[PDB]
Design a protein around this ligand. Structure first.
Ligand SMILES: Nc1ncnc2c1ncn2[C@@H]1O[C@H](COP(=O)(O)O)[C@@H](O)[C@H]1OP(=O)(O)O
Ligand code: NA
Ligand code: NA
Ligand code: NA
Ligand code: NA
Ligand code: NA
Ligand code: NA
Lengths: 97, 217, 484, 194, 145, 194, 96, 49
């Protein structure tokens, strides 16, 4: 988290057919399911992977970045680690901080 | 089946291959986390098809031999989904799974069966963030080829002409756009028809199952 | 049994000439079985049965109740598998299902070769392979579809299909359990097939290929001898007699009393079920194993001659009598009205009162003190600090079945009152109160929220209940309710 | 979720024959009417506005955070109907919050901190929750149910041989509890002893 | 459903509930489904309605009771409603994620009036009767408008 | 258009492959459609639809929990008698007795023993009736413990009655048969013939 | 149909049964319809039904016996239905 | 993880929901240290909890 660079996404409508890109059959079918008419998917006969041509009218999400004005917080001292208190790695990765 | 099961159980518990001993059971490795046992058993069913009676209480060495008896050597739905995600989420822009097999064929001379193993080992050493450069992606696959060499015990330009065909291809595309030509309409209609063929073929196959060839002829 | 007399139920023996004539001895064996059964009951424990055609309202369903009451283990097929049908068979098992009984309901289309083969494979397959691991003792293949108004020249798709259900796939079904038994070297546990046969073969006409179906089954009496399946299946033909349906007004029931005036017996479904369950008594099970059995369960109907013309006369005379009385009634009514005026018949027409909903809060009933003081011990009086007794004073919910009022009706009774139905209609916005002019006339009460047409409480159930139930409770997720 | 609670609280007062909440303050101090109702996850639609809609730069009320909190359903109830300055102890009890609520409510009256207490539980259904209960395999898999020929009516079948996971739902339940001594004094109906 | 059956069964066994007197289970979620937080508030509303009506609703989706539960001899799993001649007390039991166990006991309200004098009861009956007429007035007006 | 054509030629792109494959598939559709149409002409729509599969092992509902249903049946009888829904004349109480007897085990007897012994005959004639019926039913269940269960139809046998009123309305009732009051007598009737 | 007992009855036998019963009924029905269509009440067509004295006597005849026995309904359908003026039924019990 | 990471199809533990609940901190405390079968009443009190 960097309050000076908040990551957001903006919906935009594709104005022009995009360049095709490769993807799994499973993923290509997922794109097709969402976009319907507005994406073509085609098996690549050799690889068995699929090409994914996002068409004009499709919706994209383009990352953009906000400057926020709360830059300061009361934070647990840098270096604090549940490990130094004796808590296992398995507990640390299971559990919310 | 022992490499495939080791990698799937290791990747689920988010631990390297050395951390999970094959002598231990799924119920053992999971601790009391029956939520994670249900996921591993669902993933092994998705992968291989059938399962022994109590897979959670079978040690993974033994589970491997039961799966081996009915296993073709092919990667199956669960492995293939996780390798597609590894490549699409952790490899740099344009470095497809097909680019990563071309590199394992060119640089290390590995056929489709052995690349399957190199990518399985790559899945259990999955980088935490996306790799930055094409250089870092090749450096990763080199390191993963040498880990596969250990586990299985094995010892280890027409790009200017391709560059032009890309230009030609793009000039065609912009001309098609201007002409309002839909270069793919034909294939679209074909895929739709191929489906209505399979649909009718099934109806006709069903009638043959019910009435029999003698009657229908 | 008076000698010279043929009972209304008997068994038959095949004469060397090849006809099936009454046999006094076998008939005694059977009729004594029935008498025993009626006083002491019959057990069917350890009997494994497949029964097709046991839908609600059928003879089969009455047979099934009996099998379960006797502790049989039974597979029922239904071609109309649904929650209504599933719940029906559950309520049968919950009422009649004896110790040692089990009931297995499967969807099944006896018209499908594949279903036939799959059903028998399922019954015989191990539990390890997701089968029942059973070996059948009786098959009761009563599945059938009606064909009416289909004479010779009308016989087409329905009839050819009906004939497949009621003959060719019964042969197939028998063949399958033959194959399954032989495959496992089962030479000494024959399955008794209760064939549903007819005494009348194209006597009445218009039955499509019913008569051809039912007559064809009579080959099995001889195929038992001539082919290699005698140790696997035994054949027990039931010649099923005139059987008054669910005891309501049928075109067949209305002439039953008439037929009986001839000295002939029609049967309730329970009577015919008893007759048939009488063929699963140990005595006649063993008789089937010696030679094929044939049970006339046709209440001496064989003996009334020209049975069609006679049947048809009985119906004509009933309908004639009804029609002329209805016509003469309507005309003497009109002749009265013309002579006496529409005055005379306004001082006749009663005033009916239709109910309006009167939704209640249902506060608890307070009994008189004398009665309420008997509930608690005498000693409790003045024993508790009542500031430290915690009491629920009111309650409510918003949930899939509306308010606590409507949910309780659905939980406890499974259907809404008028008051429940009107509350649901109001909640869901089907109806809104209105008080003022509706098209120049003044109106007070419910109105359809869309059309603004008035709605009487009496019509709310007919107009909206199906939709209320379709869009209440546990159901497919509706996107409009969760933000798309 | 707050709408389900407002309607439930209103209907519960009516079931207690209390038409105007301020009637309680004829019998009781403003400090002695409490709300010990709670929720498992609270205002999950507000949570989505915070975590997802904001991320997409979709327009979302600036006070959306306030509406997500488990304890603001009870806040709106007090700010729109009750106007008590009494206890406000809001349990999170997952599937058991309603019984936890009764327990806290009972103890809150028996301590003398309150003579009347609103009590009960509430939770909505939304995309994200449904998915996560699925990922935990707690909920019935509807495609499995269909394979078994089950209609939605029969997909919640407790204590059955073939039971196969819970059927998720939405809504609210409120009870009004008080000192029996007060219930008698006020002449309100008495449906049960806790 | 197994854990719950076992813990109810052992509560009864330990407090020497009579052999042959099982508690009658109601499973309200067959109808409503499971609303997480609200789960127990709906069950309580039902318990109150059972006490006051003397009607024990049936789990209409209990097509077949799990053989494993036959061992819990102090629990009866009815599939259909019984109109009884009275219910004196109801147990509400809840189990949530994160070891949230819960039990409430609700006792029939007529046991309260045993504690007070005839004079006091009669005064209460009068007062409730008046409040109820006023609540009906409020409710119908609030509904239609 | 021509610049596109020469670029396609250079790229060895076959702009028409898609349409070619489509025309070929469209032909094999018409070919199959004709085979399927012919079968419908020969067999008819009713048969071709009718012959469709319904059976599926996963749809097999299995009912075996008689041990539970016996205690329910008993309690349902008990309360029907207390409420006067069933009287000491009704045959429904004899047949429901047979069905309880048909499920007699040690637990069922303990269940009836508890409920029958703890019913207070002083509460009214219906309580006395159920207590007596109960005691008799316990005695029965003890004798038939360890006896095979039994199919016994104890219902009133009936015959057809058709009636036509003054206004030509046709009624059909099922009426009690004159001299045939039970199945023992039905068997006698059948033996004597006509 | 030879060497086809109960458990062998399949496509051939179901087809054989169609030739030898169901489409004979159909054939009779057609000439009934054609005569009636033209009001031909006084020129019946005599149907020589080929019937069998042996119905599953020998076995292994697939659905031969069911075909040949079914034909015997026509002896009664002549009376019970509206085609007696169009078709007459003449069963020949054909010997060895 | 529930509302955003899932939406992005980023990999997230299947039991992530359990870890969000206010009452599971107290659950882990009981399941790792205390082992009580005693009361468990978990308040949401915003700044006053
Ligand atoms: N295609 C079929 N497959 C199996 N059973 C059938 C079929 N068609 C009808 N049936 C059964 O035949 C029975 C005939 O009963 P009846 O003696 O009243 O004519 C029906 O109740 C029905 O049971 P179901 O409706 O459950 O399928
Ligand atoms: Na009314
Ligand atoms: Na509800
Ligand atoms: Na869900
Ligand atoms: Na069921
Ligand atoms: Na049911
Ligand atoms: Na946590």
């Amino acid at each position: 988290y960097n309050p000076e660079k908040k990551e957001m996404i903006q919906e935009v409508i594709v104005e022009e057919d995009l360049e095709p890109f490769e993807a799994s059959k499973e993923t290509a079918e997922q794109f097709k399911h969402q976009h319907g008419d507005k994406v073509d998917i085609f098996e690549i006969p050799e690889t068995g992977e699929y090409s994914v041509k996002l068409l004009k009218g499709a919706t994209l999400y383009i990352p953009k970045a906000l400057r926020f004005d709360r830059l300061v917080a009361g934070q647990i001292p840098t270096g604090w680690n549940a490990k130094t208190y004796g808590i296992s790695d398995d507990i640390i990765s299971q559990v919310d901080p | 089946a022992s490499l495939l099961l080791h990698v799937l159980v290791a990747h689920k518990l988010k631990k390297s291959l050395d951390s999970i001993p094959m002598s231990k059971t799924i119920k053992d490795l999971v601790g009391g986390k029956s939520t994670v046992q249900n996921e591993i058993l669902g993933d092994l069913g998705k992968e291989f098809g059938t399962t022994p009676e109590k897979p959670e209480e079978t040690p993974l060495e033994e589970l491997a031999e039961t799966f081996q008896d009915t296993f073709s050597g092919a990667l199956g739905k669960q492995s293939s989904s996780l390798l597609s995600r590894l490549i699409s989420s952790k490899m740099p822009g344009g470095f497809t799974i097909t680019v990563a097999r071309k590199y394992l064929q060119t640089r290390w001379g590995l056929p489709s069966g052995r690349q399957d193993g190199v990518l399985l080992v790559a899945l259990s050493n999955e980088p935490a963030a996306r790799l930055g450069s094409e250089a870092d992606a090749k450096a990763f696959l080199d390191s993963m080829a040498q880990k596969y060499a250990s586990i299985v015990g094995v010892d280890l330009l027409e790009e200017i002409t391709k560059d032009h065909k890309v230009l030609a291809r793009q000039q065609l595309q912009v001309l098609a756009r201007y002409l309002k030509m839909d270069l793919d309409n034909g294939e679209r209609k074909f895929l739709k028809e191929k489906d209505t063929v399979a649909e009718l073929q099934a109806q006709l196959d069903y009638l043959n199952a019910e009435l029999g060839e003698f009657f229908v002829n | 049994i008076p000698r010279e007399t043929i009972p209304f139920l008997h068994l038959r023996k095949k004469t060397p000439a090849g006809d099936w004539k009454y046999d006094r001895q076998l008939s005694s064996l059977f009729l004594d079985g029935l008498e025993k059964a009626a006083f002491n009951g019959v057990t069917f424990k350890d009997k494994y049965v497949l029964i097709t055609g046991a839908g609600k309202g059928s003879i089969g369903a009455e047979v099934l109740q009996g099998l379960l009451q006797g502790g049989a283990k039974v597979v029922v097929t239904t071609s109309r598998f649904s929650k209504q049908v599933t719940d029906y068979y559950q309520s049968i098992y919950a009422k009649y299902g004896a110790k040692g009984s089990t009931l297995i309901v499967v969807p099944f289309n006896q018209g499908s070769k594949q279903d036939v083969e799959a059903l028998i494979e399922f019954i015989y397959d191990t539990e390890k392979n997701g089968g029942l691991g059973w070996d059948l003792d009786a098959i009761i293949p009563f599945a059938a579809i009606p064909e009416q108004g289909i004479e010779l020249e009308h016989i087409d798709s329905k009839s050819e299909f009906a004939h497949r259900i009621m003959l060719t796939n019964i042969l197939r079904m028998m063949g399958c359990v033959k194959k399954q038994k032989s495959a496992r070297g089962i030479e000494t546990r024959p399955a008794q097939v209760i064939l549903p046969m007819s005494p009348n073969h194209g006597t009445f006409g218009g039955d499509g290929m019913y008569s051809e179906s039912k007559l064809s089954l009579e080959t099995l009496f001889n195929r038992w001898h001539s082919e290699s399946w005698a140790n696997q299946l035994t054949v027990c033909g039931a010649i099923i007699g005139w059987t008054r349906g669910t005891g309501l007004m049928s075109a067949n029931n209305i002439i039953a009393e008439g037929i009986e005036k001839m000295g002939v017996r029609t049967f309730s479904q329970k009577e015919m079920a008893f007759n048939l369950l009488g063929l699963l008594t140990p005595e006649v099970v063993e008789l089937c194993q010696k030679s094929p059995v044939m049970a006339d369960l046709n209440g001496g109907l064989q003996f009334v001659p020209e049975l069609k013309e006679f049947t048809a006369k009985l119906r004509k005379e009933l309908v004639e009598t009804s029609e002329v009385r209805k016509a003469v009634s309507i005309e003497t009514a009109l002749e009265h009205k013309v002579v006496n005026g529409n005055s005379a018949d306004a001082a006749y027409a009663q005033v009916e009162i239709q109910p309006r909903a009167n939704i209640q809060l249902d506060f608890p009933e307070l009994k008189p003190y004398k009665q309420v003081k008997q509930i608690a011990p005498a000693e409790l009086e003045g024993l508790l600090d009542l500031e430290r007794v915690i009491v629920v004073t009111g309650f409510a919910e918003v949930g899939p079945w509306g308010s606590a009022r409507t949910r309780w009706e659905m939980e406890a009774f499974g259907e809404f009152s008028l008051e429940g139905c009107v509350e649901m209609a109001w909640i869901m916005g089907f109806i809104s109160y209105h008080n003022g002019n509706l098209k120049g006339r003044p109106y007070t009460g419910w109105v359809d929220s869309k059309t603004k047409e008035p709605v009487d409480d009496k019509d709310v159930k007919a107009k909206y209940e199906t939709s209320i139930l379709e869009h209440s409770g546990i159901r497919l997720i509706e996107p409009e309710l969760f933000n798309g | 979720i707050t709408l389900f609670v407002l309607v439930s609280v209103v209907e519960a007062f009516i079931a207690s024959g209390i038409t105007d909440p301020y009637e309680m303050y004829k019998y009781v101090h403003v400090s002695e009417v409490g709300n010990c109702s709670g929720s498992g996850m609270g205002g999950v639609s507000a949570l989505r506005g915070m975590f997802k809609d904001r991320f997409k730069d979709e327009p979302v009320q600036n006070d959306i955070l306030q509406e997500s909190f488990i304890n603001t359903m009870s806040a709106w109830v007090n700010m729109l109907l009750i106007s008590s300055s009494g206890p406000i102890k809001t349990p999170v009890g997952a599937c058991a919050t309603s019984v936890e609520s009764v327990d806290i409510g009972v103890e809150t009256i028996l301590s003398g901190k309150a003579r009347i207490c609103i009590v009960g539980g509430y939770d909505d259904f939304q995309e994200e929750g449904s998915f996560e209960f699925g990922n935990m395999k707690a909920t019935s898999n509807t495609l499995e149910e269909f394979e078994h020929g089950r209609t939605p009516a029969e997909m919640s079948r407790p204590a059955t041989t073939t039971r196969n996971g819970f059927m998720e739902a939405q809504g609210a339940g409120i009870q009004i509890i008080m000192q029996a001594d007060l219930a008698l004094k006020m002449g309100v109906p008495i449906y049960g002893i806790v | 459903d197994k854990n719950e059956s076992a813990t109810i069964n052992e509560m009864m066994k330990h407090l020497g509930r009579s052999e042959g007197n099982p508690v009658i289970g109601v499973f309200q979620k067959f109808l409503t489904g499971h609303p997480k937080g609200a789960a127990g508030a709906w069950m309580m509303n039902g318990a109150l309605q059972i006490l006051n009506s003397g009607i024990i609703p049936g789990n209409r989706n209990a097509d077949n009771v799990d053989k494993i539960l036959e061992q819990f001899e102090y629990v009866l799993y009815p599939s259909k409603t019984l109109k009884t001649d009275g219910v004196r007390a109801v147990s509400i039991t809840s189990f949530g994620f994160g070891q949230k166990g819960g039990q409430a006991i609700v006792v029939h309200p007529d046991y309260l009036y045993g504690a007070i004098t005839e004079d006091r009861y009669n005064e209460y009956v009068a007062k409730v009767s008046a409040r109820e007429k006023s609540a009906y007035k409020f409710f119908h007006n609030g509904m239609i408008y | 258009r021509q610049q596109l054509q020469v670029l396609a030629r250079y790229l060895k792109m076959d702009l028409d492959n898609g349409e070619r494959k489509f025309l070929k598939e469209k032909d094999t559709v018409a070919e199959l459609q004709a085979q399927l149409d012919y079968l419908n002409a020969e067999l008819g729509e009713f048969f071709v639809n009718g012959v469709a599969t319904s059976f599926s092992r996963k749809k097999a509902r299995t009912f075996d929990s008689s041990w539970n249903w016996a205690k329910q049946s008993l309690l349902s009888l008990y309360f029907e008698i207390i409420h006067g829904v069933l009287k000491n004349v009704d045959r429904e109480v004899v047949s429901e007795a047979i069905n309880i007897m048909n499920r007699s085990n040690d637990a069922l007897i303990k269940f009836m023993e508890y409920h029958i012994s703890n019913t207070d005959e002083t509460k009214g004639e219906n309580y006395q009736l159920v207590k007596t019926l109960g005691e008799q039913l316990i005695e029965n269940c003890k004798q038939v413990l360890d006896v095979d269960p039994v199919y016994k139809d104890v219902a009133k046998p009936t015959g057809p009655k058709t009636a036509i009123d003054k206004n030509g309305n046709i009624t059909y009732s099922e009426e009690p048969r004159e001299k045939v009051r039970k199945l023992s007598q039905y068997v006698q009737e059948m033996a004597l013939g006509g």
